[PDB]
Amino acid sequence: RCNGVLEGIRICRKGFPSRVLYADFKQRYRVLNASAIPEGQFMDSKKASE
């Protein structure tokens, strides 16, 4: 609390709380439109998730 950590989380959550790292995003969710999400993730680690 006194760190600022809990306040950074607050401000985040007012905002865009959860933030996924791209690969961490690919792997876990490729399966959703499997063909088109996998291609995206593989083809550009970032551009993929896009």
Binding site: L6, G8, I9, P17, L21, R28
Partner: protein
């Protein structure tokens, strides 16, 4: 795994084996029931929701305990996908306990 070499020896303290991960993120999860909760002695411990008192909650514990606590003494629990997240701020559950 492939990547980690540079560290190699440090690796285990930086990152976990690609299955330790996998074995952790890919596991059974029941959102609607799994939760974090307030706790008089220990700050926040985890538990499973048992019933619902309309604005009270009864929960089991992880150690084995049952408490009926307010609705807001109860906090969700992140899917396993967020086990030992490098950046807690990527979690979809920005709580006090989850952190």
């Amino acid at each position: 795994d492939a990547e980690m070499a540079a560290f190699g020896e440090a690796a285990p303290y930086l990152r976990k084996s690609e299955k330790e991960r996998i074995e952790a993120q890919n596991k059974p999860f029941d959102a609607k029931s799994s939760v974090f909760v307030v706790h008089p002695k220990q700050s926040f411990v985890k538990g499973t929701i048992q019933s619902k008192e309309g604005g009270k909650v009864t929960v089991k514990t992880e150690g084995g305990e049952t408490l009926t606590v307010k609705e807001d003494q109860v906090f969700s629990m992140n899917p396993p996908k967020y086990d030992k997240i490098e950046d807690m701020a990527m979690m979809t559950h920005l709580h006090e306990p989850a952190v």
